[PDB]
Nucleic acid binder design. Sequence first.
RNA 1: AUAUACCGCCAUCUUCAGCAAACCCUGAUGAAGGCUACAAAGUAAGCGCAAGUACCCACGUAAAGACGUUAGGUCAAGGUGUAGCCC
Lengths: 51, 17, 132, 337, 225, 63
Amino acid sequence: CPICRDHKLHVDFRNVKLLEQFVCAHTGIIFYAPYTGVCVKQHKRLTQAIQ
Amino acid sequence: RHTAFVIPKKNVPTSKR
Amino acid sequence: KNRAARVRVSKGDKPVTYEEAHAPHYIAHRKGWLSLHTGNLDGEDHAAERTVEDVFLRKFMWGTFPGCLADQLVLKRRGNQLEICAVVLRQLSPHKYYFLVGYSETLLSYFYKCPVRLHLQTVPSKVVYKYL
Amino acid sequence: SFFTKLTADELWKGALAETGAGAKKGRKKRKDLNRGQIIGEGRYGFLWPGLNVPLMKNGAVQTIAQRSKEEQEKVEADMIQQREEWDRKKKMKVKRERGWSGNSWGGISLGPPDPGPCGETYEDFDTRILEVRNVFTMTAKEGRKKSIRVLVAVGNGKGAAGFSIGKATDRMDAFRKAKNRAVHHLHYIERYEDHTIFHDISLRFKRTHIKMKKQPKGYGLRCHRAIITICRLIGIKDMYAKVSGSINMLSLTQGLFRGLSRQETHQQLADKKGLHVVEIREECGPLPIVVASPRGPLRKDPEPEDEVPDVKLDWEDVKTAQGMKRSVWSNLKRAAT
Amino acid sequence: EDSTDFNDKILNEPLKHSDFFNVKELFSVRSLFDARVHLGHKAGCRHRFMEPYIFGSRLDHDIIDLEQTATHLQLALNFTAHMAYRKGIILFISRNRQFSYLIENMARDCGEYAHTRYFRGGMLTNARLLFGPTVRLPDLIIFLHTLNNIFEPHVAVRDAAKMNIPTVGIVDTNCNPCLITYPVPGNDDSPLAVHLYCRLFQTAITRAKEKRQQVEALYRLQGQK
Amino acid sequence: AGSRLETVGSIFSRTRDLVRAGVLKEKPLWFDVYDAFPPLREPVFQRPRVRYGKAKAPIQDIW
RNA sequence: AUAUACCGCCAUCUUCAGCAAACCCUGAUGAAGGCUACAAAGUAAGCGCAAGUACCCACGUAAAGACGUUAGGUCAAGGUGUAGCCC
Ligand SMILES: [K+]
Ligand SMILES: [K+]
Ligand SMILES: [K+]
Ligand SMILES: [Mg+2]
Ligand SMILES: [Mg+2]
Ligand SMILES: [Mg+2]
Ligand SMILES: [Mg+2]
Ligand SMILES: [Mg+2]
Ligand SMILES: [Mg+2]
Ligand SMILES: [Mg+2]
Ligand SMILES: [Mg+2]
Ligand SMILES: [Zn+2]
């Protein structure tokens, strides 16, 4: 998936520029996993880091 | 397998009067 | 339908030379012969021997100058001289042409026991008469 | 016998059998064997001065020499390796970006249209295939004749887009005809805020029904895959569309362009009625947003307020608003489009 | 630096005047009436899109409202003059064989082009193949007759619109004016009417060309000094 | 070049829109003239229909 | 062995005049279709016919005769793909 294919992308609550890519800029909702294709494991880590 | 292969080519300069 | 020595019509992208563009019924009308000797004149002999020699010389030159010949050979015989006129391309270096000329003339002179000469005319590319 | 041998062209023409009755009514690859061969190189490994080796060495003319058995083995082995590498490159397969499905032509890009004769260019336009069909016609002599019919769409992503059909015996010729012709039949599509349509569009073209809904930003393209392709060429980012009746690709494409080209902008509505066009957004509260004002005089009499509008409603829209629409296939999660 | 002043004094200046070439002095409702421009075809031949321009029917013979003819003719002549002023290519078209010779002479005299012969398929939509890749198409097409000789619209009306070429056209009561850019309702049969049209367009084009030379010459004299 | 869809709008609207969209690099020679002195009616293609029922032509007899 | 993998050389309609790239237009941009000379959408390189040439003429006779049709004929002219035999 997009997160797991690049080992230099780190899902961290401080790396906000990466987290913004998984949030809708118009509605503020977090994209569901099939939208971007991230696996369930990384989608949970993204949801926790975003929160 | 897949066969919808796009292969672009152009005619040869063999049309000159 | 007749087939012999006919380059058939295509999509207009096949370049043909002047010789290739004329069917057999144009021989002596619009195109000449590729070999001239006295063997086929009335009352002359040794037509069979001249023919075998011509067939060999064409194969020899084709494989001796691979990818260089831009047209068919013209074979001429006067007395016991044998002149080979060939139109070649300008891809090989001149040194290799001079080597192959000195090599082929000498080898053929000893093979057919007669003075053989090779005249080369170079062209930048195969002369196109029409696109069939 | 030396006199029974033939040339390479004659040998390949026979072995390939590209011509023949078997290849006429639907009833092996050539290899150039003179490719890596060097004039003068033979099995015995002789070094001919002036042919396969330099004529002069150290200012002196070289003499006839012959490579040693070991040195000739390396030359032979090196030539076989050079052959495998050359052949390996051909077996390498290019990574194709598939279209709607793996083996379909639909959705695949064809690149920009070819530059016109008068130095005209179309680098700003992208081309997409919508349909490839093998059409057959019966002829007196040959019988069942095979041809190709292609439908392609072009667009610059900024409102200018068009489509065209291409027909030819060969597929690549049909591709050329279609995309070069489409760039001369361009529509201009008005876009609201450069991302959606100006209003809901509902039309029928022949037997194909298309219903399009204006959507806010971030909604995406939730439409028939062919409509998604065309919307990307036009520059529409957010829209919902539903296709009903016949799903004929050509009628779908032609119907889509008719509806999108016949839409009324907000400025055209303001000029036609001589009134302000005011937009109300729930995210902006009761703030009235004027989107268009009439360039001519402004009317003084309000628009008549009919207590009950006599507009025809779509049962699918009403049934969905009442929570009575039940479908396991609606509102499914999908990849970003 | 100097190009903007050129295009501003020569190309943009005439577009700021309602009648820069004074084409309203070339005709009047009376002169059109004396040329029988108001006589139309019988009511049984009327085209539906011509009803707005018809004053009425006098004993089953449609009468063309010359008040509208005058306003349409004013716009058509004004547009033709501006295009001649801008050095546009003007092509006259007409399949009426009674006036073929007249129209070809008028085109040669005003320095423009005529096509009164059989119109071959693709003269406009396939011109680059018929003439050459660098051929320049007409900037304006003037139909003195919009119908071909089987009483159908001349194919060039459709093809001029396809190639986005504006068209001026005399439209009789049996003609279809929907695709004509500047239609002029009028009689296209009587020699007096056709002769009047040829004089008006020829004079409008000749004046505009002389005006372009007067303005250019004056612009150059003032430029040096 | 210009769109050849002669039944979609008019030569003016099609030209104006393609000029906006940057498709046409230059405006044609006639565009500025049309804009300054437009025709009374925008030349839009229309399909002629026969009249049915009680529809009649509004042409009156001249007496 | 396979002419039903083919080159090569041919039969046949042909004692024919048609074939066709590249475009354009019509049919709502469907499979498809495209002429009227007081002409109404077709333009067409090239190929064939024709013209030239051979024989005693400009006549005649030869020669020529495209694209396609019959998986037509020939693996036994020669060559050759595939398969098979190698005391
Ligand atoms: K055969
Ligand atoms: K054989
Ligand atoms: K065999
Ligand atoms: Mg025969
Ligand atoms: Mg697959
Ligand atoms: Mg009339
Ligand atoms: Mg057979
Ligand atoms: Mg004769
Ligand atoms: Mg014969
Ligand atoms: Mg002949
Ligand atoms: Mg058989
Ligand atoms: Zn993952």
